[PDB]
């Protein structure tokens, strides 16, 4: 099977430059090209540009022609996109997709990478504060507040509690820090008899916090 594997997440101050990679397997890399597409939070897909791994030709959308440089390395079957002078609205998931070798065909886009999250912000990496949302059916939860960048993962009772769990999409606060809640609905009769612990993992800061949630 064809597979495109992209580099890991990036967290950058505005103005920085980055180089993202996309390694191809399962086909002759140099018989094709690579397209790059991004998706900003809450928005649709935006085409960025294209490079041929056969003849090295490139084209880009006008808004990127000055800041983006695409290259390939046929010896490693890898495509690279350099993005200079990052702005906060470059925050997005960046995708590579297998595309046409030259202009004799139109676009392919038939296999996509898993995406690379790139966050651009003046904020500094910071793990969350975790606060209890204290409770026939009751609700309880954890407020996972003031962290940066995305993402956090939340489990309940180390994964034993999944029924009824809702972990909300993060919101960006005016502080430039993210916040979300994770909630679960449970029987009122379980509150004085059972334990509820939220497990909050924030890989970008390598922090983990467990929080007991009491009535």
């Amino acid at each position: 099977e064809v597979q495109l594997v992209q580099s890991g997440p990036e967290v950058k101050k505005p103005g920085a430059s980055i180089k993202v990679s996309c390694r191809a397997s399962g086909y002759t890399f140099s018989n094709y090209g690579i397209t790059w597409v991004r998706q900003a939070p809450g928005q649709g897909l935006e085409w960025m540009g294209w490079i041929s791994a056969y003849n090295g030709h490139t084209n880009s959308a006008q808004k990127f022609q000055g800041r983006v440089t695409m290259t390939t390395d046929t010896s490693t079957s890898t495509a690279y996109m350099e993005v200079r002078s990052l702005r906060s609205d470059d925050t997005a998931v960046y995708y590579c997709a297998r595309d046409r070798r030259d202009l004799l065909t139109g676009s392919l886009g038939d296999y996509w990478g898993q995406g690379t999250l790139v966050t651009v912000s003046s904020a500094s990496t910071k793990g969350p504060s975790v606060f209890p949302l204290a409770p026939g059916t009751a609700a309880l939860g954890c407020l996972v507040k003031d962290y940066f960048p995305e993402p956090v993962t939340v489990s309940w009772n180390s994964g034993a509690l999944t029924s009824g769990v809702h972990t909300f999409p993060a919101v960006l606060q005016s502080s430039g820090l993210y916040s979300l809640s994770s909630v679960v609905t449970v029987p009122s009769s379980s509150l004085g008899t059972q334990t509820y612990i939220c497990n909050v993992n924030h890989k970008p800061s390598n922090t983990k916090v467990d929080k007991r949630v009491e009535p």
């Binding site: 085409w47 294209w50 139109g106 996509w112 507040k145 809640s181 909630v183």
Partner: protein, 216 residues
């Protein structure tokens, strides 16, 4: 640039029933090789896009038979013969004829279910958070349908504006409902000079708005 427009932008479909998505291009999409490069992409929640249809009508190899496509050079249709829960997600058309390639705005397909009013819960700020000088008050609207809901915060009967943020989950792939959080953020000083905190919820499933409140 080619302008690509999709309709509808939101498409609730009864489970098992057919659905149709329209895409229109501002130029005809016939390329210099005699093919029309109109592709349809499906983006399921939390996933990368995947190509379902290429060149208007051609199913990609690993694509169920329920997806099909047709169109003139400027007006295109993606059809799902019977919508499954696993088809929930955003569908994008893309023209691949004139670079810069451009996408439609996306059509969100969701499962249409019976109207379900939300269960409403309110959470005061924890003592732990108050110590650090901030108060978050959280209102939870759980397991409701359709997605449209209104949350109004009242602090000592005063309607609030500008100091709350909302978030809504993806449609639940089992009961077809949504949940929503509304979070009111105040300084600890402002929180402590008021008594009653209430979130008022209006939804198609409620004959009258429901209010959940607590007294400091």
């Amino acid at each position: 640039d080619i302008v690509m427009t999709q309709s509808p932008l939101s498409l609730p479909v009864t489970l098992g029933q057919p659905a149709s998505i329209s895409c229109r291009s501002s130029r005809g999409l016939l390329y210099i090789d005699g093919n029309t490069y109109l592709n349809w992409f499906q983006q399921r929640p939390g996933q990368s896009p995947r190509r379902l249809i290429h060149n208007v009508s051609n199913r990609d190899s690993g694509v169920p038979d329920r997806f099909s496509g047709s169109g003139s050079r400027t007006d295109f249709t993606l059809k799902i013969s019977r919508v499954e829960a696993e088809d929930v997600g955003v569908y994008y058309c893309m023209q691949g004829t004139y670079w810069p390639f451009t996408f439609g705005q996306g059509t969100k397909v969701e499962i249409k279910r019976t109207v379900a009013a939300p269960s409403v819960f309110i959470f005061p700020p924890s003592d732990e958070q108050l110590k650090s000088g901030t108060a978050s008050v959280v209102c939870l609207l759980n397991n409701f349908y359709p997605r449209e809901a209104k949350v109004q915060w009242k602090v000592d009967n005063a309607l609030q504006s500008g100091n709350s943020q909302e978030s809504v989950t993806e449609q639940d792939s089992k009961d077809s409902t949504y949940s929503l959080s509304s979070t009111l953020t105040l300084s600890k000083a402002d929180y402590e000079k008021h008594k009653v905190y209430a979130c008022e919820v209006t939804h198609q499933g409620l004959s009258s708005p429901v209010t959940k409140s607590f007294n400091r």
